[PDB]
RNA sequence: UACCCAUGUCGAAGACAACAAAG
RNA sequence: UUGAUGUCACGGAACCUUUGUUGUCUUCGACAUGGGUA
């Protein structure tokens, strides 16, 4: 469940710490890879809990 | 002394050129330099600038001449004239200086030793060699030695690869520049011959010059004697100024599709109603007008110029959207010439990518003049591959070294083919291709690409020459040419999808014996008949046919013919063609082109890639060296099966079907979700025929396992399990029969209890004849929606899952209206007929799918699949917390207001104030009176009861003007007072100065005038302020005279053009001379009554009290302006509209005057007028539980979410954390294909009509019935305010009744009066009750409870019914579903009958409903009550209330009185969420 | 600064969301 | 714009893998406007 992984590292991510950001980027890239190569992990039809906070953290990561 | 002979080389083919290399790179070690020593060379005028020109060295020509001389001497026993020639010398001691060494054998004729290293006399071959500069070859250059910008100005670079014979895949490649002979045919040079050279050497040189047929990679004869950028920028600017960037990639491709013809611009689609408001071509000048003047340009009149213009425009828009040895062969040499044609029997693909064009992923090779090219390299490679197939031995040679001596290489060393081009220059077609994720069933990430395809029917000239010592062609060559003459010439790439199959036709051949002196001399004289004139002369003497191979080996591919027969519509999507087509639809089916002569004929077809993918999916579920990898190929090995395009036997005309998505809350059309499609019509009565063929390798066809695999897959395809094409969920692409011919029956061999009745319902609804019930009610959902993390995958038939079919019958219990919306004038007023497909009455599978989905989403508490989550609601206020203000970070507060008469005749203010003072930008100076004093002369017989002395002054027209002193002489004021009974009777004579004690009262009178009225000069301040004019906007317009407009005296004036010239004509209340009103007439708009004569004036500006405006207030203001400027009910005349609507105010600006309500710090609501609208703080999707909103939905929060565009995790912000609801797991969502398909419902028997038809002879057409107005559902009624107490009540269901009878009589279902025809109401063809339709629902991978609950949602219970079609609020469209067949799939061959196991499924479904909702299944009972069909002799009265009671003859309360009575906002949700709750008792 | 309402007209949605080439 | 007694480059298929597809009832009732009197 890559999406649960992304959720965990998002809730534990602090943007000051470079290691946490690198791990979050690794999780995001792993999910991207699962989407690219058709697999069972593409059957993950869920989203993210706490949409405002998750959106804020993702936007900060992209900034 | 020496003689110079001038030499000219004429090229008959595109020749090859190298790239310029640094002067240090010109060495033996450079691999690229030595690889290109047999090509033309590029000369740079200056080292660092690419400007230069081509040339051919004299060394290359000398080497070719030496080789030709060796051949000629071998054919003549080494005797040129009388003299004989030694074998020559080819041994140098210091090899290192030589750039290249001879890796080929030297032809031997005579055995004596070479000429002495220092001899007085040398043989002619040595003089030609240069042993005795006796002969100097110069360089060959273009005539006049022109210059070009670079090598790309004369040619293009192409990739030439080397493939593996076994795998069929390339493993390396190289590049070279190819220069066309049409543009650069001739090169010129000179040969300098010394006088001492023998005449025999001269004759040998001339013979070698005439015998040299190839140079630089081509056949040669040697003789010796800005609008597009401007248009793109304009279109882009129009796109950005109108905020329509998303369409760029749709506009890039569609305009590219215009490269075929300039006439296509005039045939661009228009909007519905036929006007120029297309959502693409009229975005602007419009883009259509940009492309229409571009087609009238003299420059772009030519087809080529238009094509280049369109290609450049498309590329620009796409880019914006993105942003030694001595061996004797003997004297026997023969040359066989074979001439004919290669005709494309399938579309072909010779891959060649241009790096200056990035719009297309895969591109075909063309000539500079846009003709199709059959390259020599591809023909040679295919010949080599076929020779290797004949010999069954791969050639394990490596580049470099001595020549390979296998039979394939020996035959290939004598082979010459000629490069060919076509006479057909039309643009290639573009095909879309995708890849499907097996698990979800939708496309994979990034799997969407384009491919350029060359049309079929193109004829290529073909010429082959074989030179060899044999009597004629080799046996292998004869066999290969026989294969090519039978259509087994697979010459191009993309062979697995049926590309590049050619047939050789009109083949003629002739063998010339070059060992004969006379024939050899004739061959030399005519230059071997290589040029066009010599080629024609040779063709006149060519023998027809081809030699027959002595040892013939069978071809490796066999053709299997496919016949598909489909009883359903079919579409293969082509969105781009739909954008340039006059039909104006969202999608059209795939169409390909066939080249007939130089013209292109369009034919409808089924793409080969789609069939290949469907078949591959079929084989992969009833089961790298896997069977799939050995049958269908992989990224490592080429496939053994080649699918072709399937074309329809009889040409079908496309038909247009309209679809709309229904909101689950309002029961009406969802926003922006109305669409159409153009499939190919198919039906059980007249099916679609698809004829085609594929090719299978024989070795696969003789293998048992592969044939068994294909047979099981094709058996499942024949059994309807795998639909063809798109949109199978709505009944498209059902394969009724598939048949395979030509396989020797090796694959074709494998292809080979009543239903329990419905339970009677326990639902009880008691109907009383006195009451009147509402047409619809809401089912309040349960608080819990079960979701699952992982839905089932489409990758295999899972164990314990039921896959099969349900045959069902639908019965009409009330009249049904399913309209055919292609024609709006079947019987302006719109008329529609019943939906038909080829004169057969049908119901589309989308209608039934939506109807059954609405009930399945309710039986299993699920998400509201269709919901306009982003809708913001507004409410009209009624006639205290709205304070004046002026804008702008903050709005200031004004202390007080006053009415300034503007449209009356008492003042002349319109003259005395400038435009800016009227607009409100500049402060004004006006006197304000707050209270007006009114006096009674006598004590009443009034809290103030002021008593004071009054002195009369004058009396006229009844009124008395006098001055009054009161407050013990403190306050003196003048006024006019009308004669009052019991008070003015005291004073009857005019003494002009009489004293009288009087009582003065004070009345509120808030008025402001620029100049003090001359009647009353006392009691006025001089406060500044701002004048807010909205305009005369309180207007009560109507088409019939009321009371005020009827009481007008005189002619009604016309409505003036200016809104400043309005002046009050009449008074509503004439006794008191108040309520001023302006009355006017204008044509069909009829009567306008303006009851507003005072504007507003805000004074006592308090700057300190300024309040912040958050973005919420601004977006609410924007919504208010949008609903103001997009009002269908707006007054026809703009002079009676407010400034925010008259001048189309799109945003608030600094200095605007408003009424606002605020908290301690921020503003909460802003309105432009006194009585206005109020917008909701939340979007409607926030008025329901998050478990009820769609699983995959919209952004209802306060975030742009466009910042995370171009990032994938954005999809995770629109999906539910817990997964998919039961309805989304069955019917599917955008990211997940559903497990159910609903087919079209055909009518079993003859139709029964509601209204008898006009023609008694035609029982297949029915009479028309006219319906009352169908108007939008209003969420404002269900949700009557912004309070959190108001929620979305639930799913809306319409009740069953018989109100359709009154409409059939022609009467309004509420008033009982006649339905008069209007431009907005509709006329429909309807069927009556008792009609039976039969349809079919296919399911795969269903759990037991899903089948049980789907069966329940279909059949429900006896006493329950479904609602389908239009006018459901008027009683039409009650239907019932009874399941007749459930067939289940156990094996690919065995299908069991499942009518027996229906009970258990149902029970298990209910068992699931118990663990989900434990003893709280109350929404089921409400749904049952709403689905309740009224019993016989029990006829409820169900209708909508009118606007007012005065409009309803029956005396039932209207909407206004109901709003404050039975349907007050407090109990409205409980009365509307309770099924069968009345609103009138009668 | 307190009350009071008054008038009866009118169509809407017309495609949206995703994939835009990877190996 | 070459050197020369030694060029099989017509010595080399831009080839191989990928479903324009997934999701959607041609549906439907109370709304619109801003003031007026004291
Ligand atoms: Zn010699
Ligand atoms: Zn070989
Ligand atoms: Zn495999
Ligand atoms: Zn859902």
PDB file of N, CA, C and O in Angstrom, chain B residues 777-798:
ATOM      1  N   UNK B 777     -39.964  12.766  -3.357  1.00  0.00           N
ATOM      2  CA  UNK B 777     -39.531  12.730  -1.966  1.00  0.00           C
ATOM      3  C   UNK B 777     -38.070  12.301  -1.919  1.00  0.00           C
ATOM      4  O   UNK B 777     -37.470  11.956  -2.938  1.00  0.00           O
ATOM      5  N   UNK B 778     -37.489  12.340  -0.726  1.00  0.00           N
ATOM      6  CA  UNK B 778     -36.070  12.077  -0.534  1.00  0.00           C
ATOM      7  C   UNK B 778     -35.880  10.930   0.444  1.00  0.00           C
ATOM      8  O   UNK B 778     -36.542  10.872   1.485  1.00  0.00           O
ATOM      9  N   UNK B 779     -34.976  10.021   0.104  1.00  0.00           N
ATOM     10  CA  UNK B 779     -34.617   8.906   0.971  1.00  0.00           C
ATOM     11  C   UNK B 779     -33.390   9.328   1.766  1.00  0.00           C
ATOM     12  O   UNK B 779     -32.305   9.512   1.203  1.00  0.00           O
ATOM     13  N   UNK B 780     -33.554   9.485   3.072  1.00  0.00           N
ATOM     14  CA  UNK B 780     -32.440   9.893   3.918  1.00  0.00           C
ATOM     15  C   UNK B 780     -31.466   8.733   4.069  1.00  0.00           C
ATOM     16  O   UNK B 780     -31.849   7.676   4.587  1.00  0.00           O
ATOM     17  N   UNK B 781     -30.214   8.880   3.644  1.00  0.00           N
ATOM     18  CA  UNK B 781     -29.290   7.745   3.654  1.00  0.00           C
ATOM     19  C   UNK B 781     -28.900   7.344   5.064  1.00  0.00           C
ATOM     20  O   UNK B 781     -29.060   8.095   6.029  1.00  0.00           O
ATOM     21  N   UNK B 782     -28.385   6.127   5.172  1.00  0.00           N
ATOM     22  CA  UNK B 782     -27.785   5.677   6.414  1.00  0.00           C
ATOM     23  C   UNK B 782     -26.468   6.415   6.652  1.00  0.00           C
ATOM     24  O   UNK B 782     -25.885   7.014   5.744  1.00  0.00           O
ATOM     25  N   UNK B 783     -26.003   6.376   7.897  1.00  0.00           N
ATOM     26  CA  UNK B 783     -24.816   7.136   8.270  1.00  0.00           C
ATOM     27  C   UNK B 783     -23.517   6.442   7.887  1.00  0.00           C
ATOM     28  O   UNK B 783     -22.447   7.038   8.051  1.00  0.00           O
ATOM     29  N   UNK B 784     -23.576   5.214   7.381  1.00  0.00           N
ATOM     30  CA  UNK B 784     -22.388   4.408   7.132  1.00  0.00           C
ATOM     31  C   UNK B 784     -22.377   3.941   5.684  1.00  0.00           C
ATOM     32  O   UNK B 784     -23.374   3.404   5.193  1.00  0.00           O
ATOM     33  N   UNK B 785     -21.248   4.147   5.009  1.00  0.00           N
ATOM     34  CA  UNK B 785     -21.002   3.638   3.665  1.00  0.00           C
ATOM     35  C   UNK B 785     -19.800   2.708   3.748  1.00  0.00           C
ATOM     36  O   UNK B 785     -18.681   3.155   4.030  1.00  0.00           O
ATOM     37  N   UNK B 786     -20.024   1.415   3.511  1.00  0.00           N
ATOM     38  CA  UNK B 786     -18.927   0.455   3.496  1.00  0.00           C
ATOM     39  C   UNK B 786     -18.041   0.698   2.286  1.00  0.00           C
ATOM     40  O   UNK B 786     -18.528   0.833   1.160  1.00  0.00           O
ATOM     41  N   UNK B 787     -16.735   0.762   2.523  1.00  0.00           N
ATOM     42  CA  UNK B 787     -15.743   0.894   1.472  1.00  0.00           C
ATOM     43  C   UNK B 787     -14.719  -0.218   1.636  1.00  0.00           C
ATOM     44  O   UNK B 787     -14.494  -0.716   2.743  1.00  0.00           O
ATOM     45  N   UNK B 788     -14.103  -0.611   0.524  1.00  0.00           N
ATOM     46  CA  UNK B 788     -13.056  -1.621   0.535  1.00  0.00           C
ATOM     47  C   UNK B 788     -11.812  -1.078  -0.149  1.00  0.00           C
ATOM     48  O   UNK B 788     -11.901  -0.372  -1.158  1.00  0.00           O
ATOM     49  N   UNK B 789     -10.656  -1.430   0.409  1.00  0.00           N
ATOM     50  CA  UNK B 789      -9.391  -0.854  -0.028  1.00  0.00           C
ATOM     51  C   UNK B 789      -9.067  -1.264  -1.461  1.00  0.00           C
ATOM     52  O   UNK B 789      -8.682  -0.431  -2.290  1.00  0.00           O
ATOM     53  N   UNK B 790      -9.241  -2.547  -1.774  1.00  0.00           N
ATOM     54  CA  UNK B 790      -8.889  -3.106  -3.074  1.00  0.00           C
ATOM     55  C   UNK B 790     -10.120  -3.652  -3.780  1.00  0.00           C
ATOM     56  O   UNK B 790     -10.715  -4.633  -3.303  1.00  0.00           O
ATOM     57  N   UNK B 791     -10.542  -3.075  -4.900  1.00  0.00           N
ATOM     58  CA  UNK B 791     -11.597  -3.702  -5.697  1.00  0.00           C
ATOM     59  C   UNK B 791     -11.061  -4.908  -6.452  1.00  0.00           C
ATOM     60  O   UNK B 791      -9.854  -5.116  -6.575  1.00  0.00           O
ATOM     61  N   UNK B 792     -11.988  -5.715  -6.958  1.00  0.00           N
ATOM     62  CA  UNK B 792     -11.610  -6.882  -7.739  1.00  0.00           C
ATOM     63  C   UNK B 792     -10.960  -6.462  -9.054  1.00  0.00           C
ATOM     64  O   UNK B 792     -11.290  -5.431  -9.642  1.00  0.00           O
ATOM     65  N   UNK B 793     -10.029  -7.288  -9.521  1.00  0.00           N
ATOM     66  CA  UNK B 793      -9.278  -7.008 -10.730  1.00  0.00           C
ATOM     67  C   UNK B 793      -9.871  -7.717 -11.931  1.00  0.00           C
ATOM     68  O   UNK B 793     -10.408  -8.820 -11.818  1.00  0.00           O
ATOM     69  N   UNK B 794      -9.774  -7.074 -13.083  1.00  0.00           N
ATOM     70  CA  UNK B 794     -10.186  -7.624 -14.366  1.00  0.00           C
ATOM     71  C   UNK B 794      -9.148  -8.549 -14.970  1.00  0.00           C
ATOM     72  O   UNK B 794      -9.257  -8.871 -16.157  1.00  0.00           O
ATOM     73  N   UNK B 795      -8.150  -8.979 -14.193  1.00  0.00           N
ATOM     74  CA  UNK B 795      -7.026  -9.726 -14.743  1.00  0.00           C
ATOM     75  C   UNK B 795      -7.298 -11.220 -14.864  1.00  0.00           C
ATOM     76  O   UNK B 795      -6.585 -11.901 -15.609  1.00  0.00           O
ATOM     77  N   UNK B 796      -8.296 -11.750 -14.160  1.00  0.00           N
ATOM     78  CA  UNK B 796      -8.609 -13.169 -14.264  1.00  0.00           C
ATOM     79  C   UNK B 796     -10.010 -13.416 -13.727  1.00  0.00           C
ATOM     80  O   UNK B 796     -10.579 -12.583 -13.020  1.00  0.00           O
ATOM     81  N   UNK B 797     -10.559 -14.576 -14.084  1.00  0.00           N
ATOM     82  CA  UNK B 797     -11.810 -15.056 -13.505  1.00  0.00           C
ATOM     83  C   UNK B 797     -11.502 -15.643 -12.135  1.00  0.00           C
ATOM     84  O   UNK B 797     -11.000 -16.766 -12.032  1.00  0.00           O
ATOM     85  N   UNK B 798     -11.800 -14.891 -11.082  1.00  0.00           N
ATOM     86  CA  UNK B 798     -11.475 -15.328  -9.734  1.00  0.00           C
ATOM     87  C   UNK B 798     -12.369 -16.486  -9.311  1.00  0.00           C
ATOM     88  O   UNK B 798     -13.540 -16.568  -9.690  1.00  0.00           O
TER      89      UNK B 798
END
